[PDB]
Amino acid sequence: GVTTFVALYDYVASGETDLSFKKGERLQIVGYNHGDWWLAHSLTTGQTGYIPSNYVAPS
Amino acid sequence: GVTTFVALYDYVASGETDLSFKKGERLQIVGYNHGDWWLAHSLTTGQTGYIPSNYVAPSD
């Protein structure tokens, strides 16, 4: 599989974290138009966090 | 479109945030086997944050 990606655009973190939730809780998805997200690790900065899928390309 | 979802399993937050990055930075995707994530808002608790896609189903 592809292990490394390149950022195609700048992205500034909003500070949002993941959300704890209980089975049976009702949730609304926000910002669907921006697409899905993945957890990633920066080789360049060493930090880890969520990134938008459509901001990266295989490298 | 579907505006509300129901959680099928419990999920406990890890505390990870989103990541700032510059165009041209190289990144490695972690935990691909867990699938993709969405931003969501809890109707029951009022909080917002990332959730795993395969933990929710469309709901009324």
Residue numbers in the entry:
A (entry chain A): 82 to 140
B (entry chain B): 82 to 141
What do the authors of the reporting publication say about this deposited model?
The Src homology 3 (SH3) domain is a ∼60-residue modular domain that consists of two antiparallel β-sheets orthogonally packed to form a single hydrophobic core. This domain is present in many proteins and regulates critical cellular pathways by recognizing polyproline-rich motifs (PRMs; Kurochkina & Guha, 2013). Three-dimensional domain swapping (3D-DS) is a mechanism by which some proteins can oligomerize by exchanging identical domains or structural elements between monomers. In previous work, the 3D-DS of the c-Src SH3 domain has been characterized and its dependence on experimental conditions has been described. This work explores the role of the hinge-loop composition by interchanging residues in the RT and n-Src loops between two SH3 domains: one being the c-Src SH3 domain, where 3D-DS has been described, and the other being the Abl SH3 domain, where 3D-DS has not been described to date.
Nevertheless, replacing the residues of the RT and n-Src loops of c-Src with those present in Abl results in the formation of intertwined dimers. Crystallographic structures of the intertwined dimers of the Src_Abl-2 and Src_Abl-RT chimeras were obtained. Interestingly, both domain-swapped structures differ from those previously obtained for the WT c-Src SH3 domain. In the WT protein, a salt bridge between Arg95 and Glu115 stabilizes the dimer. This salt bridge is not present in the Src_Abl-RT (Arg95Ser) and Src_Abl-2 (Arg95Ser and Glu115His) chimeras, where these residues are replaced. In addition to the salt bridges, hydrogen-bond interactions may facilitate the formation of the dimer. Thus, in the structure of Src_Abl-2, the opening of the RT loop results in the formation of a long β-strand stabilized by several hydrogen bonds: the Ser101A side chain interacts with the backbone N atom of Ala94B, and the Asp99A side chain is hydrogen-bonded to the backbone N atoms of Ser95B and Gly96B (and vice versa). As in the WT, the side chain of Asp117 interacts with the same residue in the complementary chain [Asp117(OD2)A–Asp117(OD2)B, distance 2.5 Å]. Under the crystallization conditions at pH 5.0, the protonated aspartate enables the formation of a hydrogen bond; meanwhile, the anionic form must destabilize the dimer. Besides, in Src_Abl-2 the Abl residues introduced in the n-Src loop form a new 310-helix that results in the shortening of the n-Src loop length and the formation of several hydrogen bonds between the two chains mediated by water molecules. Additionally, while maintaining the hydrogen bond between Glu106 and Ser123, the distal loop exhibits diverse conformations in the c-Src SH3 domain. As shown in Fig. 8(a), the two chimeras that form an intertwined dimer exhibit the highest B factor in the distal loop.
